[PDB]
Amino acid sequence: ANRAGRQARIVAILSSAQVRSQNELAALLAAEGIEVTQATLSRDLEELGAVKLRGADGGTGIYVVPEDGSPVRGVSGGTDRMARLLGELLVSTDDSGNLAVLRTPPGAAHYLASAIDRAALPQVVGTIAGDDTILVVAREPTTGAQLAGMFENLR
Amino acid sequence: GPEVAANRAGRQARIVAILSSAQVRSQNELAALLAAEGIEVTQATLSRDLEELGAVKLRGADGGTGIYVVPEDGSPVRGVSGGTDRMARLLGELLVSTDDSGNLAVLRTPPGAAHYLASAIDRAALPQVVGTIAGDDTILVVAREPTTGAQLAGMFENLR
Amino acid sequence: KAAPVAGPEVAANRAGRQARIVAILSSAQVRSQNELAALLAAEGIEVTQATLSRDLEELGAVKLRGADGGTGIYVVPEDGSPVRGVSGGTDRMARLLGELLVSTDDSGNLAVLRTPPGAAHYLASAIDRAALPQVVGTIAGDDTILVVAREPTTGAQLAGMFENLR
Amino acid sequence: ANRAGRQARIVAILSSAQVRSQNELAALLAAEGIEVTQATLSRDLEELGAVKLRGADGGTGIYVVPEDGSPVRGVSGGTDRMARLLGELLVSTDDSGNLAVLRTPPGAAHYLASAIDRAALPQVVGTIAGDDTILVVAREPTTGAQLAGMFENLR
Amino acid sequence: ANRAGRQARIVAILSSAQVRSQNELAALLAAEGIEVTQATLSRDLEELGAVKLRGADGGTGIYVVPEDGSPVRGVSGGTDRMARLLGELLVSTDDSGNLAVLRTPPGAAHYLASAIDRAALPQVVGTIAGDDTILVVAREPTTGAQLAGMFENLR
Amino acid sequence: AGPEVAANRAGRQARIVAILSSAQVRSQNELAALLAAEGIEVTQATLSRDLEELGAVKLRGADGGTGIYVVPEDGSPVRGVSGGTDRMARLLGELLVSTDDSGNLAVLRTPPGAAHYLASAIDRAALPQVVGTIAGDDTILVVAREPTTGAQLAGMFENLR
DNA sequence: TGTTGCATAACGATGCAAAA
DNA sequence: TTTTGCATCGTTATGCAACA
DNA sequence: TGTTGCATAACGATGCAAAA
DNA sequence: TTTTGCATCGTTATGCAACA
DNA sequence: TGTTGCATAACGATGCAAAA
DNA sequence: TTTTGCATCGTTATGCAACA
Ligand SMILES: NC(=[NH2+])NCCC[C@H](N)C(=O)O
Ligand SMILES: NC(=[NH2+])NCCC[C@H](N)C(=O)O
Ligand SMILES: NC(=[NH2+])NCCC[C@H](N)C(=O)O
Ligand SMILES: NC(=[NH2+])NCCC[C@H](N)C(=O)O
Ligand SMILES: NC(=[NH2+])NCCC[C@H](N)C(=O)O
Ligand SMILES: NC(=[NH2+])NCCC[C@H](N)C(=O)O
């Protein structure tokens, strides 16, 4: 029942049991020989990298050891990221009234359009993408003409 | 404007927004940043929300108390699956017909409803589905072997 | 036609029934609501004329006189081709609106609605059927809808309507 | 005699009033001088071509005179129609298992895919369209190979 | 003479070899008995209809004999073509400001929208298609109202 | 006085296909001229690299040798040849989230909206073992042609980034 | 049927003292 | 010098009732 | 890592003279 | 009368370095 | 809040007799 | 010879309660 030897037995338990909470982890260890208290397990999981992952509607969650690196890749970034994509797949800029008209390679529309929404520009009312064209609605007083050139200057 | 909504649709979309561009490490903290927009809700629902959103409190700070992150569509959380409570709702609201062929399950919906339903299915991340793909009034659900298309169709059927 | 024996298993709700209704009215000569209830029954779909009336009323179906004498047939306007002359329709749009509407905003003659991912097209469809006289038409992406207000109505004005209507 | 001068006054009433029912049409005529009974109005509207149109969720409906020709163009046809479209915009046919893979000109996918659904082929489980590609799922025992060639033979 | 018997042996070589260049075609013939020079082969391929086809990212290319007729069907035409499609699947025209609103049969949107882009109308800033609706952005001074009626007059 | 094109491949290429479609280009240097006629100055070196990635072919239209340039229209890939990975491999390591399979199907996942973009590069690749593709928003279905299997395709995409 | 607040149990991280 | 347990309190989950 | 220009080799079409 | 080779020059491909 | 059945009023088409 | 009204009955709409 060594200290560093206990954690190696925890890893195995997790990779074959839906461990709900730390209490139930004391049990899975208890009936297994090794016996500890909730407080200390919280410490092991801490340094063991383990986390409490769950499905999209999977209630409480389960403790599991992260594999490759990051267990979850959450929602994308902001402005600087859009700038990079923008320069990568922006074909042409144009405007008409409060409207800015972006043209992209076939199918690339939605991807770029999303990156734009992500940046949450205060001067933008929202976007709509087709296949090779995006409409960017500017909010008063800002004009589509402005946005048009605006996108240009970070392509 | 933009004038957010006074419902789950509005609040949730607003929730993911914040958690994405901020360092939220506690549910009550979220309730504060929401209040900072005229969005007042109790921690009870917030718990019910980011649980339906599939949000996880990953330890970013090298010490216990970590941050909140919401898995980006297309990149479901590796390891877990759970999620039906909602899919079951939309399923009894949008499902027109179930049918199958081979390892494929063919769901039908009203016009335009295709993508919406499939999204809830993707979040459900069912272990027996490899993934989904939607058109306008049709969804294809790829059953992962040895599970069959017929079998999937059955599930969707008696689950509404 | 659709049975779990040799075909697609229809649903036990409005979604399923309605989609099945339009199907029949399209490939058949239905001239009475009770007749519809029969052809539906012929598929294990049993419903009363009360709801059928509520259904094809929400579907925007009309009893056009095809037979040169009074008693005509039923037809459901094809999306993109709304009925010319009338507009009415909110009861449903109002429902989906309070369920899918994330945010309302505007600019010029445009009203910008936001929805959850994928919900864009679904909502816009209910709006198209509503055929509001002050909207020229709609167009949806994935999480965004553009509603073109017809002059002199303004984008701001439309945004307001959608707002307090949920 | 007079019976034909009355109908000309009915046309005008309709083009400027939300006439709900035939009773309320007797009223609109009554307070206007001309007076008749429900039974006969049913006859006038009959031969006048008038119909009771309504919005998608517009409740009861209103009597109106059809303009150009047909007031409403309802849901499309069936098999023979698909055949026409099919020959018009089908680029290539192929298959793999229970799957038939149709290729169309850019964007034409959804249109053709719809025409296919309309035909409601008993040997088809449903379709899904992208931009220039459609997937047609065949139902056992029918194979995608069959459908593939099937489409070919009516292009 | 023998000149007509050599080409028949070239056809076969091509239908079973990735012939990169004409030099390597002299070799494939050389070690086969028949021997000629680069200059003359250029002439044979010329009248043999053969062409140098290649994949989308398939480098140099390969000589192959066209089968049915045209080996490649390239990007679509221009204005007169759009006119044909336009009359075929245009449900209704309308406008609001610099915007023209086209309505099509379900799913037909993207197809027609593409044909419009193809015409590259100088008075058009670009288009965006949904399912049964297209938005056509006019460029100043041209108004959506103009475009709206413009489309009408070639339906 | 019009749409302001871009100063990159995205802009130039889209502009290239435009010209080749509505014109009779019979030489690469000629293209460089018509491009220059729009403030688009590039060397024949890249133009060669461009219309090679576009899959353009110099088909003999004029009854004599010197023919014109045509770019195959999406949905109508060139019959006979396949080649094309250099680009698909790029987008693949940039947009591919996860690979999975089932039966004759390969299921690729991408970020939101990226689905169609990736699938397009795959379609142009015209791989002999793929019958075709179809994309949603964050998912692509790749139909492997027998005897090739879905699992097999998944593998390829995997170790190719 | 779907949703939210309230009040309470369930659960996890950490200071501080004792033990190996 | 370090590790574990105790005890505490910040944090998250849920039965239940109210309401629409 | 992705891209473009430069300079150079690789490659293909054609006039002109000799050969079958 | 036609066909092939020589030689030439317009056309296309690429190693390499520069640059971001 | 969304939905469906039940029972009832609202509504429209038609046979048959009287009126212009 | 035709047109309108009466009266009837097939057809469609809805308040209300039950239920989820
Ligand atoms: N699917 C296509 N190839 N469409 C071509 C035209 C696209 C249209 N302008 C849009 O972005 O909506
Ligand atoms: N209204 C339409 N766009 N119909 C075409 C799409 C139909 C096809 N079953 C799909 O869901 O992809
Ligand atoms: N995942 C996505 N496809 N996002 C696109 C969002 C913006 C896009 N213009 C729309 O119509 O909503
Ligand atoms: N123009 C495009 N977006 N092409 C993408 C093609 C992807 C796939 N073959 C589909 O039809 O969905
Ligand atoms: N089947 C549908 N998606 N219908 C809704 C269409 C929404 C909008 N009118 C568009 O064309 O984009
Ligand atoms: N934002 C969305 N459209 N989500 C639904 C995605 C459904 C399916 N995975 C697809 O890619 O088509």
Side-chain angles (χ1 to χ4, degrees), chain A residues 103 106-107 109 129-134, chain C residues 139, chain D residues 105-108 131-132, chain E residues 110-115 117-118 126-130 134:
Chain A
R103 292 290 291 252
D131 190 64
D132 58 7
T133 306
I134 314 174
Chain C
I139 182 180
Chain D
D131 190 63
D132 58 8
Chain E
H110 271 283
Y111 189 40
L112 169 61
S114 190
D117 291 336
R118 299 260 138 118
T127 62
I128 180 181
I134 315 174

PDB file of all heavy atoms in Angstrom, chain A residues 103 106-107 109 129-134, chain C residues 139, chain D residues 105-108 131-132, chain E residues 110-115 117-118 126-130 134, ligand 1:
ATOM      1  N   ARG A 103     -16.349  37.687 -50.811  1.00  0.00           N
ATOM      2  CA  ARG A 103     -16.336  36.531 -51.698  1.00  0.00           C
ATOM      3  C   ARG A 103     -15.216  35.580 -51.291  1.00  0.00           C
ATOM      4  O   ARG A 103     -14.095  36.006 -51.019  1.00  0.00           O
ATOM      5  CB  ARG A 103     -16.164  36.965 -53.156  1.00  0.00           C
ATOM      6  CG  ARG A 103     -17.352  37.726 -53.728  1.00  0.00           C
ATOM      7  CD  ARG A 103     -18.548  36.807 -53.916  1.00  0.00           C
ATOM      8  NE  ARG A 103     -18.338  35.837 -54.986  1.00  0.00           N
ATOM      9  CZ  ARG A 103     -18.949  35.885 -56.164  1.00  0.00           C
ATOM     10  NH1 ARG A 103     -19.816  36.856 -56.422  1.00  0.00           N
ATOM     11  NH2 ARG A 103     -18.697  34.958 -57.080  1.00  0.00           N
ATOM     12  N   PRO A 106     -15.070  28.443 -53.292  1.00  0.00           N
ATOM     13  CA  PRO A 106     -16.281  27.623 -53.180  1.00  0.00           C
ATOM     14  C   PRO A 106     -16.363  26.886 -51.849  1.00  0.00           C
ATOM     15  O   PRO A 106     -15.405  26.220 -51.465  1.00  0.00           O
ATOM     16  CB  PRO A 106     -16.120  26.622 -54.322  1.00  0.00           C
ATOM     17  CG  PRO A 106     -15.337  27.362 -55.345  1.00  0.00           C
ATOM     18  CD  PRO A 106     -14.392  28.254 -54.585  1.00  0.00           C
ATOM     19  N   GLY A 107     -17.492  27.018 -51.157  1.00  0.00           N
ATOM     20  CA  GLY A 107     -17.722  26.305 -49.911  1.00  0.00           C
ATOM     21  C   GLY A 107     -17.056  26.912 -48.688  1.00  0.00           C
ATOM     22  O   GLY A 107     -17.455  26.640 -47.556  1.00  0.00           O
ATOM     23  N   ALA A 109     -17.205  29.802 -47.621  1.00  0.00           N
ATOM     24  CA  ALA A 109     -18.020  30.867 -47.041  1.00  0.00           C
ATOM     25  C   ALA A 109     -18.322  30.658 -45.559  1.00  0.00           C
ATOM     26  O   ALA A 109     -17.916  31.456 -44.715  1.00  0.00           O
ATOM     27  CB  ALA A 109     -19.315  31.032 -47.828  1.00  0.00           C
ATOM     28  N   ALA A 129     -23.892  33.513 -44.541  1.00  0.00           N
ATOM     29  CA  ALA A 129     -23.027  32.925 -45.552  1.00  0.00           C
ATOM     30  C   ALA A 129     -23.790  32.014 -46.506  1.00  0.00           C
ATOM     31  O   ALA A 129     -24.713  31.306 -46.107  1.00  0.00           O
ATOM     32  CB  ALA A 129     -21.885  32.163 -44.892  1.00  0.00           C
ATOM     33  N   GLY A 130     -23.397  32.048 -47.773  1.00  0.00           N
ATOM     34  CA  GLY A 130     -23.943  31.148 -48.768  1.00  0.00           C
ATOM     35  C   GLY A 130     -22.953  30.037 -49.054  1.00  0.00           C
ATOM     36  O   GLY A 130     -22.759  29.138 -48.233  1.00  0.00           O
ATOM     37  N   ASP A 131     -22.316  30.104 -50.218  1.00  0.00           N
ATOM     38  CA  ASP A 131     -21.296  29.131 -50.580  1.00  0.00           C
ATOM     39  C   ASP A 131     -19.963  29.818 -50.845  1.00  0.00           C
ATOM     40  O   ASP A 131     -18.927  29.402 -50.331  1.00  0.00           O
ATOM     41  CB  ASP A 131     -21.716  28.331 -51.812  1.00  0.00           C
ATOM     42  CG  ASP A 131     -20.802  27.155 -52.074  1.00  0.00           C
ATOM     43  OD1 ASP A 131     -20.754  26.247 -51.218  1.00  0.00           O
ATOM     44  OD2 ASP A 131     -20.135  27.137 -53.130  1.00  0.00           O
ATOM     45  N   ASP A 132     -20.001  30.870 -51.656  1.00  0.00           N
ATOM     46  CA  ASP A 132     -18.795  31.603 -52.015  1.00  0.00           C
ATOM     47  C   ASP A 132     -18.985  33.090 -51.761  1.00  0.00           C
ATOM     48  O   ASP A 132     -18.227  33.917 -52.265  1.00  0.00           O
ATOM     49  CB  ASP A 132     -18.432  31.360 -53.484  1.00  0.00           C
ATOM     50  CG  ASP A 132     -19.546  31.758 -54.436  1.00  0.00           C
ATOM     51  OD1 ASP A 132     -20.546  32.347 -53.975  1.00  0.00           O
ATOM     52  OD2 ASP A 132     -19.422  31.482 -55.649  1.00  0.00           O
ATOM     53  N   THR A 133     -20.006  33.422 -50.977  1.00  0.00           N
ATOM     54  CA  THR A 133     -20.325  34.814 -50.684  1.00  0.00           C
ATOM     55  C   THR A 133     -20.830  34.981 -49.258  1.00  0.00           C
ATOM     56  O   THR A 133     -21.616  34.170 -48.768  1.00  0.00           O
ATOM     57  CB  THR A 133     -21.397  35.366 -51.641  1.00  0.00           C
ATOM     58  OG1 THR A 133     -20.984  35.174 -52.999  1.00  0.00           O
ATOM     59  CG2 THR A 133     -21.622  36.842 -51.389  1.00  0.00           C
ATOM     60  N   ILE A 134     -20.380  36.037 -48.595  1.00  0.00           N
ATOM     61  CA  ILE A 134     -20.843  36.350 -47.252  1.00  0.00           C
ATOM     62  C   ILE A 134     -21.388  37.765 -47.220  1.00  0.00           C
ATOM     63  O   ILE A 134     -20.838  38.660 -47.861  1.00  0.00           O
ATOM     64  CB  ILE A 134     -19.706  36.253 -46.218  1.00  0.00           C
ATOM     65  CG1 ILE A 134     -18.896  34.971 -46.421  1.00  0.00           C
ATOM     66  CG2 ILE A 134     -20.266  36.328 -44.805  1.00  0.00           C
ATOM     67  CD1 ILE A 134     -17.681  34.877 -45.525  1.00  0.00           C
TER      68      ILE A 134
ATOM     69  N   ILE C 139     -33.994  34.949 -45.767  1.00  0.00           N
ATOM     70  CA  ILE C 139     -32.880  34.114 -46.195  1.00  0.00           C
ATOM     71  C   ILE C 139     -32.054  33.720 -44.977  1.00  0.00           C
ATOM     72  O   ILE C 139     -31.693  34.568 -44.162  1.00  0.00           O
ATOM     73  CB  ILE C 139     -31.996  34.831 -47.232  1.00  0.00           C
ATOM     74  CG1 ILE C 139     -30.871  33.911 -47.700  1.00  0.00           C
ATOM     75  CG2 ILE C 139     -31.428  36.118 -46.660  1.00  0.00           C
ATOM     76  CD1 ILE C 139     -29.956  34.549 -48.717  1.00  0.00           C
TER      77      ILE C 139
ATOM     78  N   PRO D 105     -24.434  19.690 -61.496  1.00  0.00           N
ATOM     79  CA  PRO D 105     -23.738  20.973 -61.602  1.00  0.00           C
ATOM     80  C   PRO D 105     -23.779  21.676 -60.252  1.00  0.00           C
ATOM     81  O   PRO D 105     -24.686  21.411 -59.465  1.00  0.00           O
ATOM     82  CB  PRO D 105     -24.578  21.741 -62.626  1.00  0.00           C
ATOM     83  CG  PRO D 105     -25.281  20.692 -63.412  1.00  0.00           C
ATOM     84  CD  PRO D 105     -25.552  19.581 -62.448  1.00  0.00           C
ATOM     85  N   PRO D 106     -22.806  22.556 -59.983  1.00  0.00           N
ATOM     86  CA  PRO D 106     -22.714  23.275 -58.708  1.00  0.00           C
ATOM     87  C   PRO D 106     -24.057  23.846 -58.251  1.00  0.00           C
ATOM     88  O   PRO D 106     -24.727  24.541 -59.017  1.00  0.00           O
ATOM     89  CB  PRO D 106     -21.743  24.409 -59.027  1.00  0.00           C
ATOM     90  CG  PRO D 106     -20.865  23.848 -60.084  1.00  0.00           C
ATOM     91  CD  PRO D 106     -21.730  22.942 -60.913  1.00  0.00           C
ATOM     92  N   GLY D 107     -24.440  23.545 -57.014  1.00  0.00           N
ATOM     93  CA  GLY D 107     -25.655  24.084 -56.428  1.00  0.00           C
ATOM     94  C   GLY D 107     -26.930  23.380 -56.848  1.00  0.00           C
ATOM     95  O   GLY D 107     -27.951  23.473 -56.167  1.00  0.00           O
ATOM     96  N   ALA D 108     -26.876  22.671 -57.970  1.00  0.00           N
ATOM     97  CA  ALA D 108     -28.058  22.013 -58.512  1.00  0.00           C
ATOM     98  C   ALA D 108     -28.503  20.819 -57.673  1.00  0.00           C
ATOM     99  O   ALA D 108     -29.605  20.304 -57.851  1.00  0.00           O
ATOM    100  CB  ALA D 108     -27.809  21.585 -59.948  1.00  0.00           C
ATOM    101  N   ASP D 131     -23.869  19.998 -52.457  1.00  0.00           N
ATOM    102  CA  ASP D 131     -23.861  21.088 -53.421  1.00  0.00           C
ATOM    103  C   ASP D 131     -23.861  20.548 -54.842  1.00  0.00           C
ATOM    104  O   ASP D 131     -24.650  20.981 -55.679  1.00  0.00           O
ATOM    105  CB  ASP D 131     -22.644  21.987 -53.215  1.00  0.00           C
ATOM    106  CG  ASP D 131     -22.728  23.262 -54.021  1.00  0.00           C
ATOM    107  OD1 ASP D 131     -23.661  24.052 -53.770  1.00  0.00           O
ATOM    108  OD2 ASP D 131     -21.867  23.470 -54.903  1.00  0.00           O
ATOM    109  N   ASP D 132     -22.965  19.603 -55.105  1.00  0.00           N
ATOM    110  CA  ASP D 132     -22.839  19.006 -56.429  1.00  0.00           C
ATOM    111  C   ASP D 132     -22.890  17.488 -56.339  1.00  0.00           C
ATOM    112  O   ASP D 132     -22.501  16.788 -57.271  1.00  0.00           O
ATOM    113  CB  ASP D 132     -21.534  19.445 -57.094  1.00  0.00           C
ATOM    114  CG  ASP D 132     -20.310  19.082 -56.277  1.00  0.00           C
ATOM    115  OD1 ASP D 132     -20.453  18.357 -55.272  1.00  0.00           O
ATOM    116  OD2 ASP D 132     -19.198  19.519 -56.638  1.00  0.00           O
TER     117      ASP D 132
ATOM    118  N   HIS E 110     -29.796  27.882 -54.855  1.00  0.00           N
ATOM    119  CA  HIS E 110     -28.364  27.879 -55.136  1.00  0.00           C
ATOM    120  C   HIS E 110     -28.031  27.720 -56.617  1.00  0.00           C
ATOM    121  O   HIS E 110     -27.120  28.372 -57.124  1.00  0.00           O
ATOM    122  CB  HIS E 110     -27.650  26.812 -54.305  1.00  0.00           C
ATOM    123  CG  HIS E 110     -27.189  27.301 -52.969  1.00  0.00           C
ATOM    124  ND1 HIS E 110     -26.066  28.086 -52.811  1.00  0.00           N
ATOM    125  CD2 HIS E 110     -27.695  27.116 -51.727  1.00  0.00           C
ATOM    126  CE1 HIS E 110     -25.902  28.364 -51.532  1.00  0.00           C
ATOM    127  NE2 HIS E 110     -26.876  27.788 -50.850  1.00  0.00           N
ATOM    128  N   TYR E 111     -28.766  26.858 -57.309  1.00  0.00           N
ATOM    129  CA  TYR E 111     -28.508  26.630 -58.726  1.00  0.00           C
ATOM    130  C   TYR E 111     -28.667  27.921 -59.521  1.00  0.00           C
ATOM    131  O   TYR E 111     -27.748  28.344 -60.224  1.00  0.00           O
ATOM    132  CB  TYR E 111     -29.419  25.532 -59.282  1.00  0.00           C
ATOM    133  CG  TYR E 111     -29.054  25.093 -60.687  1.00  0.00           C
ATOM    134  CD1 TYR E 111     -27.725  24.960 -61.071  1.00  0.00           C
ATOM    135  CD2 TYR E 111     -30.037  24.795 -61.622  1.00  0.00           C
ATOM    136  CE1 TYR E 111     -27.385  24.557 -62.347  1.00  0.00           C
ATOM    137  CE2 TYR E 111     -29.705  24.390 -62.903  1.00  0.00           C
ATOM    138  CZ  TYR E 111     -28.379  24.272 -63.259  1.00  0.00           C
ATOM    139  OH  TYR E 111     -28.042  23.869 -64.533  1.00  0.00           O
ATOM    140  N   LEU E 112     -29.835  28.545 -59.399  1.00  0.00           N
ATOM    141  CA  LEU E 112     -30.117  29.799 -60.091  1.00  0.00           C
ATOM    142  C   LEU E 112     -29.158  30.904 -59.664  1.00  0.00           C
ATOM    143  O   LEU E 112     -28.659  31.660 -60.498  1.00  0.00           O
ATOM    144  CB  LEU E 112     -31.559  30.239 -59.837  1.00  0.00           C
ATOM    145  CG  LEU E 112     -31.919  31.663 -60.270  1.00  0.00           C
ATOM    146  CD1 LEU E 112     -31.737  31.841 -61.767  1.00  0.00           C
ATOM    147  CD2 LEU E 112     -33.343  31.998 -59.865  1.00  0.00           C
ATOM    148  N   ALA E 113     -28.910  30.997 -58.361  1.00  0.00           N
ATOM    149  CA  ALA E 113     -27.990  31.991 -57.823  1.00  0.00           C
ATOM    150  C   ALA E 113     -26.625  31.886 -58.496  1.00  0.00           C
ATOM    151  O   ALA E 113     -25.978  32.896 -58.772  1.00  0.00           O
ATOM    152  CB  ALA E 113     -27.852  31.826 -56.321  1.00  0.00           C
ATOM    153  N   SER E 114     -26.193  30.657 -58.761  1.00  0.00           N
ATOM    154  CA  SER E 114     -24.910  30.433 -59.411  1.00  0.00           C
ATOM    155  C   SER E 114     -24.936  30.959 -60.837  1.00  0.00           C
ATOM    156  O   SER E 114     -24.038  31.688 -61.255  1.00  0.00           O
ATOM    157  CB  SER E 114     -24.542  28.949 -59.405  1.00  0.00           C
ATOM    158  OG  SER E 114     -23.202  28.758 -59.831  1.00  0.00           O
ATOM    159  N   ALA E 115     -25.971  30.588 -61.583  1.00  0.00           N
ATOM    160  CA  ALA E 115     -26.117  31.042 -62.959  1.00  0.00           C
ATOM    161  C   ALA E 115     -26.021  32.560 -63.028  1.00  0.00           C
ATOM    162  O   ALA E 115     -25.487  33.115 -63.986  1.00  0.00           O
ATOM    163  CB  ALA E 115     -27.437  30.568 -63.535  1.00  0.00           C
ATOM    164  N   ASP E 117     -24.348  34.603 -60.845  1.00  0.00           N
ATOM    165  CA  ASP E 117     -22.956  34.974 -60.645  1.00  0.00           C
ATOM    166  C   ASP E 117     -22.171  34.787 -61.937  1.00  0.00           C
ATOM    167  O   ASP E 117     -21.326  35.610 -62.286  1.00  0.00           O
ATOM    168  CB  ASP E 117     -22.336  34.137 -59.528  1.00  0.00           C
ATOM    169  CG  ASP E 117     -22.900  34.476 -58.166  1.00  0.00           C
ATOM    170  OD1 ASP E 117     -23.404  35.605 -57.991  1.00  0.00           O
ATOM    171  OD2 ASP E 117     -22.834  33.611 -57.269  1.00  0.00           O
ATOM    172  N   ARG E 118     -22.465  33.698 -62.643  1.00  0.00           N
ATOM    173  CA  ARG E 118     -21.771  33.351 -63.881  1.00  0.00           C
ATOM    174  C   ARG E 118     -21.857  34.473 -64.911  1.00  0.00           C
ATOM    175  O   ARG E 118     -20.897  34.738 -65.632  1.00  0.00           O
ATOM    176  CB  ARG E 118     -22.353  32.062 -64.477  1.00  0.00           C
ATOM    177  CG  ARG E 118     -22.230  30.832 -63.586  1.00  0.00           C
ATOM    178  CD  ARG E 118     -21.063  29.940 -63.982  1.00  0.00           C
ATOM    179  NE  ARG E 118     -20.383  29.470 -62.822  1.00  0.00           N
ATOM    180  CZ  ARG E 118     -20.159  28.277 -62.289  1.00  0.00           C
ATOM    181  NH1 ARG E 118     -20.500  27.085 -62.770  1.00  0.00           N
ATOM    182  NH2 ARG E 118     -19.492  28.353 -61.161  1.00  0.00           N
ATOM    183  N   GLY E 126     -23.018  40.989 -56.175  1.00  0.00           N
ATOM    184  CA  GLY E 126     -22.912  39.605 -55.748  1.00  0.00           C
ATOM    185  C   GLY E 126     -24.255  39.071 -55.292  1.00  0.00           C
ATOM    186  O   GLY E 126     -25.213  39.827 -55.143  1.00  0.00           O
ATOM    187  N   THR E 127     -24.332  37.764 -55.072  1.00  0.00           N
ATOM    188  CA  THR E 127     -25.580  37.148 -54.643  1.00  0.00           C
ATOM    189  C   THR E 127     -25.371  36.227 -53.454  1.00  0.00           C
ATOM    190  O   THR E 127     -24.257  35.776 -53.192  1.00  0.00           O
ATOM    191  CB  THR E 127     -26.224  36.329 -55.775  1.00  0.00           C
ATOM    192  OG1 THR E 127     -25.349  35.257 -56.143  1.00  0.00           O
ATOM    193  CG2 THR E 127     -26.485  37.206 -56.986  1.00  0.00           C
ATOM    194  N   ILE E 128     -26.452  35.956 -52.734  1.00  0.00           N
ATOM    195  CA  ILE E 128     -26.441  34.963 -51.670  1.00  0.00           C
ATOM    196  C   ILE E 128     -27.745  34.166 -51.703  1.00  0.00           C
ATOM    197  O   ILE E 128     -28.830  34.738 -51.783  1.00  0.00           O
ATOM    198  CB  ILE E 128     -26.228  35.603 -50.288  1.00  0.00           C
ATOM    199  CG1 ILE E 128     -26.218  34.529 -49.202  1.00  0.00           C
ATOM    200  CG2 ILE E 128     -27.301  36.640 -50.006  1.00  0.00           C
ATOM    201  CD1 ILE E 128     -26.047  35.084 -47.808  1.00  0.00           C
ATOM    202  N   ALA E 129     -27.633  32.845 -51.662  1.00  0.00           N
ATOM    203  CA  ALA E 129     -28.800  31.988 -51.808  1.00  0.00           C
ATOM    204  C   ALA E 129     -29.084  31.188 -50.548  1.00  0.00           C
ATOM    205  O   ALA E 129     -28.168  30.746 -49.858  1.00  0.00           O
ATOM    206  CB  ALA E 129     -28.626  31.056 -52.996  1.00  0.00           C
ATOM    207  N   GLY E 130     -30.366  31.010 -50.252  1.00  0.00           N
ATOM    208  CA  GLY E 130     -30.783  30.171 -49.147  1.00  0.00           C
ATOM    209  C   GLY E 130     -31.285  28.845 -49.673  1.00  0.00           C
ATOM    210  O   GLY E 130     -30.500  28.004 -50.110  1.00  0.00           O
ATOM    211  N   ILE E 134     -33.278  34.106 -52.995  1.00  0.00           N
ATOM    212  CA  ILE E 134     -31.969  34.651 -53.321  1.00  0.00           C
ATOM    213  C   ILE E 134     -31.962  36.156 -53.081  1.00  0.00           C
ATOM    214  O   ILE E 134     -32.949  36.839 -53.349  1.00  0.00           O
ATOM    215  CB  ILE E 134     -31.603  34.396 -54.793  1.00  0.00           C
ATOM    216  CG1 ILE E 134     -31.920  32.954 -55.186  1.00  0.00           C
ATOM    217  CG2 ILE E 134     -30.139  34.726 -55.045  1.00  0.00           C
ATOM    218  CD1 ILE E 134     -31.714  32.673 -56.661  1.00  0.00           C
TER     219      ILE E 134
HETATM  220  N1  LIG M   1     -23.255  26.278 -54.799  1.00  0.00           N
HETATM  221  C1  LIG M   1     -22.737  27.148 -55.653  1.00  0.00           C
HETATM  222  N2  LIG M   1     -21.726  26.785 -56.431  1.00  0.00           N
HETATM  223  N3  LIG M   1     -23.234  28.376 -55.724  1.00  0.00           N
HETATM  224  C2  LIG M   1     -22.745  29.415 -56.621  1.00  0.00           C
HETATM  225  C3  LIG M   1     -23.333  30.755 -56.220  1.00  0.00           C
HETATM  226  C4  LIG M   1     -23.256  30.890 -54.715  1.00  0.00           C
HETATM  227  C5  LIG M   1     -24.073  32.034 -54.124  1.00  0.00           C
HETATM  228  N4  LIG M   1     -23.566  33.319 -54.591  1.00  0.00           N
HETATM  229  C6  LIG M   1     -24.013  31.948 -52.608  1.00  0.00           C
HETATM  230  O1  LIG M   1     -22.950  32.131 -52.016  1.00  0.00           O
HETATM  231  O2  LIG M   1     -25.013  31.675 -51.947  1.00  0.00           O
END
